[PDB]
Symmetry: C4
Subunit: 381 residues, 4 copies
């Protein structure tokens, strides 16, 4: 987890969302020293437990209500349970990663501080702050809008089937914990995306510095600069591995929830497109599909970019080697090339899979298969 | 995008098809200088927008017609919408790539000019022109024949179900924009195939030159020649990456359309083969299947050939190294071998997948699965 | 197969379970000399043959009984046959591997003795013994508890459908050979997991020793130590290959049984969750699912850990090379790096697949597909 | 295609089966000079055309017969057509490869002659002849037995449904061309397996020679021997590539036919196992399944063995390098290691897939999916 001054807003949003239980103090030199926050550690743990319990209690009550609005039939019961369960697993894994990653966070932030010192010439504090705040604000606004639309639509549906025997809106009111879990999931995804985008952006800055200093007496200084860049590349790879070791299970469960939500929402979208019951529900489901795809991209694109930027450094170094002739510089470039020959740049989700754009192809194949099966099933009955 | 004098006909065909909005002027030395064409940029943008709008307006009208000819049932509606949508996505992605690839096109053409200067001994202007014109002519003729057959068959079908209440041929007339989109797609695929085949052919020429000059005073000249060949190989790899970065989304959507069209056309072919309603429709669908498979090959084979020819250069260089003994030449060959050790030759479709013949195996597996599901569904009802 | 004094209990458990037909004698220096045990070889062979015959005889009798309890319908017959057959294949492959792996076991134990001599500073006899005995005890206790619960539940089911015409509990009594096969399978899996965990743990110890001796006159001794560590790494890779060559078919059939059991048990769990017949059966099936997943992890995690620990040694050696400057030590580190550049660390299940955590992703995909098909089938009828 | 004196019987069997249209003359030194045989080229071409035409004419007649025995229903018609078509595609591709591979065969045999000269110490003429003749004889005997059983079973089935209106045995008599195609397919598979096994066996002999000469004045001779072994390894890799380039399409269509036959035969086996109509048919179908799996192994195992033996040479060479110290020998071993670092050992089926044991896993997954779909389809109706 990256905790830096430009993107401290994301850190605070995660902290109040029970995902970053860390106490941070800004040093006199600007470095943000990090430590464990026992108060906020307990806050996160009990908030997660209470919210998960409330979510499942609401599910049970809706199932046991006089007239369930969402948990009505066996199929609807199973699908609602699956959706809530994937959200719960994602947020619980994120909270667990936040609780048990103080050392990884400390090491990652120290490495990032050293790297940023190395790449000081390319730092843009205002641009980084605005990008991070824009990502957080747009994600939170999108999830808030979608939660509001979903709550309104479900209240409308419940009132349509409402009977004088019992009030049905309280069933919807009991689904608020689920949407709070959605907010926590959005915060977790924003935090992970911020960290991964930071790593990829620093890889890109390192490549740009390499090209600008080696492709466009003092030979010793140039060799020192190349050694610093090689060390920064190695440290960025280690930072990618730190983020993987810290949030691989969280990313894995985020991907699982993305896949399940995409499949279920596409299935219901097709069902209602053939039925043509309510158009408002159709647009709401389309917005939900867009949001699920967008968060899948938010978790996949950063890792793909990081891997790509880490892997093109070897080509840059090969060009430098073919262009450089000085003995010390040539030896340093040879060492850097040998180091890059065996780097593992890709983000690994607990070793289950490699997180890059090929995951999008796998998800597309799985969604196509499941949708074919389910839709051709509903068509033949 | 390759824009060279031998294959300028393909460039003009793409330009009038809203895919290559570039103004080209032939220099006194034969080099084709390229620049942005604002007139043709606007022409391409508005032509694409208007044609897509007309296609979807025709779909809507047919759905809303007195007696739809194609958009009759929910299944037929969905399948027609899917087919038109994949075609629209493919052509729109191709047009977008054409609009936003002026710099990539310029760099690729400059690199190709330098490489052809290096490989001047193997250039065959007349053969290249005839191959390019033959590919363009055969592709355009095949799509024209298929469009004519499809229009005739659909007019026959509409007249068979025609009633005195309303005229049904106008529904078919409203599908002309869809076939114009098919023509644009054919032009886009021909252009991409021409560029990729050019890259693969230049890789093959480079390998042949290497073998002919190193396997079948002056040592300095030979080392210079080997350095030029190594630089040409590196530049050809960079050209493959340029084509990828410029048209990866277009290739991805072309592959998606190929997969969807193959699946749908095979499904309907099997359905009518069991029903045995009209044989003419059966042969038309078989021709459509052949055309879809042929364009899938046209997009897959060039990339596979380019990767293969790029990858066998390392074996050629290993043989040269085992055969060469001169100090300067040995060092140059060692440098070339080190460069080849870490080349990424494969074409990447936006990072989603690697475009080679294995995509054919993946498509075969997906088509087999989908066809099994759908056909066994229709058999059990 | 690893046969060491700390984990001799696992060896004895496997020996009495017809999986390790070896006679072992502890030398005066503590080394456990191993040889073929013809008495126990015959015991294992005839025990396996008799138990498999009894299992299939019980299946046949239950099918031919007056009122079958498990082999009642065609679907139930097929599923019970498939489950029993996967268990039989797994245990038979394990027994065959045990019978025909005396030379591999001898070589592996000799290599492990030499490696442990090299890594003597990190040996923990009591910890290894307690971990091995805990794994064996927990596995055997879990399988015993599950077998008891299954037998009780099936006796309850048989008595519920019991009629005065015939006694149905004898049908359950005829399924004891199947549960004995389950015990043999548990022993085989514990043995394989013990060996693979030993290899991975020794890889980790080697990496820790490397880091502690090279990252935190005498230069010759340090070079000798590095040479010994490199030889230990090579020998550990060869030991992984020995375990693969010896038990690849056993691991493959264990994975096949895990996949089939997970699919079938999840299918029945969903069926009874929708039916809601008996909750006790539901919890028993959930426990069975947990056990199948746990044994899948027990066979997958050790190989993944071994591969990971083998692969991070190259990064450690790269750091050492960048840190070391002495001529002899630098040359030794270069040799070690070259050796590590081409190591194949992964466990191969007879070449069919590479055993690591990606197998979990493949199993998840297959289970999801099969469950979607089967459950949507049962829903549409 | 390997054409050597020890395995000349396989060559003659292929030649009379229209697969090896080559004229061979044994030189005074034992080398089998090969050339094109125009008489046998024409014989092969017309035999293949006539047999395919007769097969499809028999299919058409059976479909159009008074009471079809095999092409009765739409499902049976489609399945019989698919089976015959996969067999026809396999044999036609094999014949085409035989016709258009004279140069590849010549180069492969010359390379094999040179390699066998290098590896003369490990040649076993009698063992090779007996292994080749045993493979050919067992394959031909198995296919003959299966064809006889199939013909007898189909005659029994036709006579059971026979009516006095028309004679039904002539329908079976019209299926003889299909079984002749089966014989041609068996010959093609035996030939390909013989060649691939030869390549793998020579790789193993090379590895054994390396180990026996480098792991268990004259230094110049030893370096010459190592250079000869390295050249033999490179030539064996080139021979694997020659076999791939010559018979990749044949192997691909053999694999496709294997997959289709396995799926269809398993489907019918399960259908009749649930129906329990005739046990003799059940055993015949089980034998057919065993034969299809055995020929899948016959095409997959040789390539896997060749790749494995080619890939372990690098480990052997690494050990030799760590053990050798002489300057000339050390340089030769370094050159050999560099050569092995970049070898592509695997057999490629026209680039569609890599032929090794993982193809068995892919086939198992595909068969499981298709069988699940089809069987659960038949169960729910």
């Amino acid at each position: 987890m990256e905790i830096s001054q430009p993107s401290i807003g994301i850190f605070y949003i995660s902290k109040v969302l029970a995902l970053a239980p860390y106490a941070t103090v800004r040093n006199s030199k600007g470095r943000v020293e990090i430590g464990r926050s026992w108060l906020f550690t307990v806050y996160s743990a009990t908030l997660t437990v209470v919210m998960v319990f409330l979510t499942y209690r609401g599910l049970l009550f809706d199932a046991n209500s006089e007239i369930p609005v969402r948990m009505k039939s066996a199929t609807s019961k199973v699908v609602t349970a699956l959706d809530v369960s994937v959200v719960v697993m994602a947020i619980v894994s994120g909270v667990y990663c936040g609780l048990f990653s103080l050392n990884d966070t400390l090491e990652l932030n120290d490495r990032l501080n050293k790297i940023d010192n190395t790449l000081n010439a390319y730092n843009n504090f205002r641009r980084d702050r605005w990008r991070a705040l824009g990502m957080a604000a747009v994600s939170l606004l999108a999830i808030s809008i979608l939660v509001g639309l979903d709550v309104g639509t479900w209240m409308r549906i419940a009132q349509d089937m409402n009977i004088a025997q019992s009030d049905t809106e309280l069933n919807v009111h009991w689904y608020i914990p689920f949407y709070s879990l959605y907010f926590i999931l959005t915060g977790l995804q924003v935090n992970i995306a911020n960290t991964a985008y930071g790593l990829g952006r620093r890889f890109g800055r390192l490549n740009r510095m390499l090209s600008s200093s080696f492709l466009a007496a003092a030979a010793k200084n140039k060799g020192l600069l190349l050694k610093s860049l090689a060390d920064s590349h190695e440290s960025l790879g280690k930072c990618v591995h730190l983020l993987s070791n810290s949030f691989g299970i969280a990313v894995l469960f985020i991907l699982v929830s993305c896949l399940l939500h995409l499949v279920a929402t596409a299935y219901f979208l097709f069902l209602e497109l053939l039925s043509k019951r309510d158009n408002g529900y159709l647009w709401v489901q389309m917005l939900w599909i867009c949001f699920h795809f967008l968060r899948l991209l938010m978790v996949v694109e950063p890792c793909h970019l990081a891997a790509r930027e880490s892997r093109k450094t070897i080509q840059i170094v090969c060009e430098i080697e073919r262009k450089v002739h000085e003995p010390i510089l040539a030896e340093a470039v040879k060492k850097f090339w040998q180091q890059l020959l065996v780097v593992d740049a890709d983000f690994s989700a607990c070793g289950l899979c490699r997180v890059n754009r090929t995951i999008l192809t796998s998800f597309a194949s799985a969604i196509a298969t499941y949708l074919v099966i389910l839709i051709q099933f509903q068509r033949t009955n």
